Amino acid sequence: ELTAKLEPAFLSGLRCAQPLIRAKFFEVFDNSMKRRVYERLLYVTCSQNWEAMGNHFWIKQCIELLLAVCEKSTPIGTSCQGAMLPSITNVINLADSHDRAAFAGNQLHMLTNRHDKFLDTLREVKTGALLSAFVQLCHISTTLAEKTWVQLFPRLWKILSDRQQHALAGEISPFLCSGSHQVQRDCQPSALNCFVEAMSQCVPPIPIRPCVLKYLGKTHNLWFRSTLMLEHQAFEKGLITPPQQEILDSLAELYSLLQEEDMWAGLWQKRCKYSETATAIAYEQHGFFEQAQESYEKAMDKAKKEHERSNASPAIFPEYQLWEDHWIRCSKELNQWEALTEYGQSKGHINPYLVLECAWRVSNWTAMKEALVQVEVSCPKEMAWKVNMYRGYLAICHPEEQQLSFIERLVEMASSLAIREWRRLPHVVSHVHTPLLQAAQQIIELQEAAQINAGLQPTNLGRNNSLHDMKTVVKTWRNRLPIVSDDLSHWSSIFMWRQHHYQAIVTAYENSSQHDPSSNNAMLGVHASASAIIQYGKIARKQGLVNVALDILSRIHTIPTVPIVDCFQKIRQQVKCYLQLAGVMGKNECMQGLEVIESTNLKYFTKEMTAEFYALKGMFLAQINKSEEANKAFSAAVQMHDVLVKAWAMWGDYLENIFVKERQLHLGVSAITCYLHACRHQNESKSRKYLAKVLWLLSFDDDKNTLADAVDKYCIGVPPIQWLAWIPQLLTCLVGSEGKLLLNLISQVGRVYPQAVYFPIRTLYLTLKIEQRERYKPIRATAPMWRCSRIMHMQRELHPTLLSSLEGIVDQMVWFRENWHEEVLRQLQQGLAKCYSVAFEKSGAVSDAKITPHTLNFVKKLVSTFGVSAASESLARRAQATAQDPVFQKLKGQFTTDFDFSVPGSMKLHNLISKLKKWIKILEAKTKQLPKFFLIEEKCRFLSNFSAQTAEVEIPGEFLMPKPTHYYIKIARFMPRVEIVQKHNTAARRLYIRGHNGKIYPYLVMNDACLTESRREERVLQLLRLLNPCLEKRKETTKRHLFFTVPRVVAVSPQMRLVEDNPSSLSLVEIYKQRCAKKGIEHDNPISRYYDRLATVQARGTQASHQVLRDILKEVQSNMVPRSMLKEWALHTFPNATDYWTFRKMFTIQLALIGFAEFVLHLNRLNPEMLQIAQDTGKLNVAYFRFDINDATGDLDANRPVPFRLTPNISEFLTTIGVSGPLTASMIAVARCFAQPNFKVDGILKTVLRDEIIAWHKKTQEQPENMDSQQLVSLVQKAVTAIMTRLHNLAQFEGGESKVNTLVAAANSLDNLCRMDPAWHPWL
Amino acid sequence: VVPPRSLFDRADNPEWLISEDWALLQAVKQLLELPLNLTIVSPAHTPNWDLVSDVVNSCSRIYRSSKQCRNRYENVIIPREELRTSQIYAQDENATHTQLYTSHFDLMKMTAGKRPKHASVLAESGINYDKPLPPIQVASLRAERIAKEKKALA
Amino acid sequence: KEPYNYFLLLRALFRSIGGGSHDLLYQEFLPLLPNLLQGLNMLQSGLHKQHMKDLFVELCLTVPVRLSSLLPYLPMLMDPLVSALNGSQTLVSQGLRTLELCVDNLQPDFLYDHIQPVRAELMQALWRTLRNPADSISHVAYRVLGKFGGSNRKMLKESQKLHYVVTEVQGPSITVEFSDCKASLQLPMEKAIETALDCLKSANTEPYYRRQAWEVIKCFLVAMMSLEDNKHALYQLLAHPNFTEKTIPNVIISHRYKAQDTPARKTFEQALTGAFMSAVIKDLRPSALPFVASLIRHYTMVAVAQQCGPFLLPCYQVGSQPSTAMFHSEENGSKGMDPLVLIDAIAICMAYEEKELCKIGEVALAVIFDVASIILGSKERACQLPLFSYIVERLCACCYEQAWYAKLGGVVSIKFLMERLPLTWVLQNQQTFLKALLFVMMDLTGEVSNGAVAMAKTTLEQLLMRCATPLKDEERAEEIVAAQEKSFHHVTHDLVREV
């Protein structure tokens, strides 16, 4: 019995920090069981109770125990023969037989003798020494122990027999369930966490019950490992049988606990048996809590009607629990707290937790006390902090049991428990951490409330320090708000708690009334309460709960007296509520808002308040189509307070709407005046949507430039920061006839922001020079060139050191140009892509298709030019010196020999494709031999010398969008190493710029042969940058973390631009090519198979049917490109479950936004080479989207068979739950956000597509004369109407169903995929 | 499977539904692999009532604590298994739990069922509402006012 | 040379004025505040030793001025705040104190606007701080997060970085045999070698675990080498006349053609660095230093036999350009680990923070030179090896490295090479040394250099004197005179441009 009683002492000896004791105890422990792997694994899984180890990471002892079985006397060695350093004499073995047969002093002999003695000393080294030292290092290091166990247990498992494996798995299943592990719960890592991670790697797999997996995930910080294991089990079982039921139950519970609302919603949409459940989930997922509540009620009525016929199976009970839980949640979001408190107090069906959450909000403190007692007897551990906080609530606010002394300790306990809960959450912060991040504010506000109530005690009441503390806490509460992504329940918590304390202040300073005879303290409490009510109503309105907001705002009338500011804000919020309602209802809500405005007793309100009221009245009358009265209202509003930006903006919108139809120029001038007067402030984010209208209106200008004259007149007083984002559009206008009057505007912007203007103007000027040289193939400079030169001259005069530094930087960029090998390789790849496009155009006639004249001229240019201010002359001299190379001459000669178009059979397209592939492979072999980096000192003396003393130069792209503050990152260094990387199917130089903050910013120097395409790509990037702020401002988009990833691109010349690199980024084709290289197959094989099958079918005198294309895609998927390539890549790349989960979720949401943009904005197709995947974060960016303008008609087409890339490898990686839930929900949320009328996305689209249409006209149809104003306006309106049509179609969400689901089904559908270009890779 | 020998071997406020009791018994039997009397078969497999509480709460009508689950098992299921819980579960035919959900749906349905003078201030400002000024004139008035304010400041 | 005391002097001065009652000193101090905070921010942004960075962060956060005066300079304080939250326990407490002061005293919109550049890193530090084992630190962090309100959970544009594995190949591993199972397993060593190197690097490690780490590293190094060399075969190979008569191939080795290191090569470099560190640790020196010297001899012999003699590898053969085949790489690579990984470890030791490691690097270079001189017959023939071109490029690369200590290691390497190797070789490589030393002088301009610039100047003067010193009448061979004239031309060309 003594040895049984001393087990904790023995386990203390095993984990002792003193190595001698630990060694003796292990020696006793090692001999206690046989030297066999299976028996020792059985010991650690069944015989050793690990509870007495305590918080020790007892996996260390498992490692020590199992390694002891290894043979110790064997000489140390490895299977990694390719990594071993070879022998000195190994050169003999590598040599041929002739040299070996031919091969067959004192200092050297002594050296070789001493070395032989050394090598003999090493040959004596045994594996046991490494094993023992390894075990000791595992004792000292927990990270090493965890890694070694995760690596080692699968390997031990593999060398077991099948019988041993089955027995060990059957014993492992209860081991994970053992109570002894409960002490590990707060260990970081848990030993059981590491054990479960090791098991997941085992092949064959070890089955674990879904409920056990969920318990381990929530208990031992195994959240995402358990989630991914349950997902895998679900997909293996085909997503019903009780096993599938329990798998989906555990997976849904994990999604709910992880606050993964979209994943849970998708799972239940597939799982649910009642269509009302899916409809309610779709409604609730997007904030339609009233409709979701109605749907849950209809579902409950249907279920009750079915219960009268027969009982309910236990398979449907999770759906009923879902209905109850989400109906309660919807009631919480709809501010129905009284009904919930009543519902929780229902006899026989009491819910003390619901009452405890609800009763305090409606001042039912008796129910709060009862619920607190019931919860305290039996409470979940995660809810402990909330119980302490509610006990503090009762201690402060209960009418009889006020105890303010307990609040400090209750706050400390709540904070400690919340921190404890935080450490049990995943290390990557996500939606699961939001409740605790809200709890932080809740707890500190509990403490601040305790301070206020201590101030209101009769001893402290009226004292100066108490008043000062009260005022300080009230102001701090006023400024400290939650965010729009927060559920309305959290806003309710914060505001109702604050309301209790504001009412306490009011009661205290109204009852006493001895001090403060002017009632300023009571007025302070009343004003705070009214402001909190108005803020709550405003947040309800912003989240779409307009009826809830109107109900909340109606509680202001309960207060006897309110300050006029709060009454003004209440009326303003009501008016905005009616405007929002009229957006979908129409005339009646406008009439109600007009009635509210008319009932307003203006006489108390100030001039600014009256002006705002009349502006709201003008908006309402404009929606009613009472144009004359609306104009009266706007005029009176602006005359009342001529600074009110909103009055000017709304009057401008009204006048622009009239101008677009009637087209009298004076209305255009009035609209431009209004818009420009609205922009006369530094808040650039507000004014951005107005300057877009101003720029769009210039398309309606006459031959006399009336609108440009108005812009020139009124634009004075508009700070240049407003124009920073527009600068591309400003330059587009500058090239036109209106540039004469807009020169002053651009000159002022260049004066204040020289770096922002300089590179665009430099690029535009050099583009104009190139176009002029092409036109007259010295020439007098055109008017746009003169204007650009004037702007640059003014900038050189005002900022000579800055512009001299920028010019020096750009002049250095010439050395970054690629060598001739890389240029010829790039041109071969581009020509191959063009040949593929032609081949798909000529798919009808494979084996008969001929090359187009464009491809003929391209190859002729390649063979004619085979790849080959002082910096430019020296570069030309270096280029000439390279031509001397005889190898280059031989390659040029044989290249010209292969690409001679006079030989028979060379004009065929597919023979050209094969020749291109051969030569691409040859040059890829030759390119790999080139140096991978070069030092800036070798050629770029200015960059190496450059420092902050040279000029205050900002890192490129800082002015693409005006940063809200002047915290611009300036350039401190150019790092001496420039790297050469293969990206975008071109050889690119990566420049590293060190910033004054010390961070290293990577930039790629890129060479583009085509100017217009680069401008179009930058145009799309600018549109994406402009759209991003809208996503930041709406719920449903902010809570899903939706944002476009737009890398900084700055053009420094027509051919060269600086891009903002992520060195951890790969393209999807690069992943595919890596998989093919590992598999040994060529990556272009599927395209060859596709065209060979087409030729085979066509040779039989028939066209390929849809079934033939389906069969081709099926063959490619079965043989060459399996569905699981991307998934297997992700599994290898992110072995940590949390990293895999985060990457996959970010990938899903970014792909949702990219596909939405591709479909709604009629962009060109997303090739897998365009899709850049950031391994370090999961963010996706596209290099590069362009508008799909039809060259023959200038209107948008984008009528491809699929709406976006949802190709089978992507679908497999996302999983069906990821496609259904987060992808669809993110697309719907983005569509609904961009369709909001207040954002005015149509104006930004008009001002971007105006530049796009001008570019198309210059490219196809053509002081050069501007294109016809009517043609430009019509084309832009048609393109914007098409975009907004697709946008509104996706935004429509009537009935809980969205066209986005059909769009996703079409994208995934194999029928549509098989009809795509093979170069698109419809299998990848 | 026989575990290897070690050096330490000595050589309730809401009523419980039958579905909850059945989940409790099945959790203890299947997951913990313990016998009726919770006698330890393998030293490493000590009873874990937190896991059982998690299992029970997956289908329970109210949160059951681990202590409550242990007390219920020891004080009801052991004496009952020594009609058995399986027999009662089979005979109930999910009627009681269905009626529970019917009652909840009825309570939720009950809760759901239980649910001029304006010209005077313009005339004081000097605004002729019935004769709108175009934006050009209002901008001119703003400029004149700003110029007069600047002159007064100077 | 030793700037630490100037910063301790600044800390003492700040702690003096920090008494608050010294208003006259506050007023006098305010004009200093912009330039001081700018300089301190630039210092803390740089690469320094841990104690130096801690001092810079503390100086940034404890400037003895009222917060109202900091308002225009608040953006300078954000990066030190993030550094403090990621620093030691005292630094984390100080950063939390400064952040709580800013939250309590400033308006939320203004403070949020200034946090926005750091904000991703600041919020990640705050979230991590919740997991800090100190209850005071975690509680203060939770209080600060609650005071931020909704700003704590606002979407980060710069998302959290994920640990991604870029390499498909498994790392090096040891073979363990389980006789009972009649099977063998591979036990992976990369993490073990990293842990051993961390143990040998840290000063807090117990001598027992330092010895264990040394044993792990030694056993791994023995396992990853062939050991198949035979005394008689080795002597027969190295005594071949080609090693002393045939012209050494004029082949250049450059890391510019090296792809990214394989896991095997990285683990080799770490293990060799740990071996050198054991050779310098006093308790491990008696066993590590002989082993390290003999292992350097082994690697040098492998390199010599591959690079020249009767059986030189095809990539070293005459007329061969630098290529990836000289290095262990995933795609083309060398057959087995290349012996050049020894030079990378020597460079790591030279560039290491603790300069005492430079001595073992010089010992290693001396051993390489002596073995090459014995095998090839002369010092002049020894320096013609491509391995010495790799040595020059890898050691001068440290001068380009950002840290002052890496630069200083490069300078010390240049000084050792110019002192030991023959004059003809020093003249051939004089321009590379000149460029490296000039870059050392240029890049540390305006930064805290712990004598690196002075050492670079002395090294440059000594190099110029040695190469420019006119040859005696007995030493005036045609080759040395021509080499000296060419080197003098190139060096004077470079110097005149710097004027």
Ligand SMILES: O=P(O)(O)O[C@H]1[C@@H](OP(=O)(O)O)[C@@H](OP(=O)(O)O)[C@@H](OP(=O)(O)O)[C@@H](OP(=O)(O)O)[C@@H]1OP(=O)(O)O
């Ligand atoms: O929710 P909305 O009705 O669309 O208007 C809100 C907000 O209004 P509330 O504070 O009344 O909710 C503000 O509008 P104004 O008070 O300026 O009239 C303004 O935020 P600021 O306080 O910073 O001006 C912002 O508009 P903007 O994006 O132009 O800043 C914003 O409108 P959004 O919903 O479009 O953001």
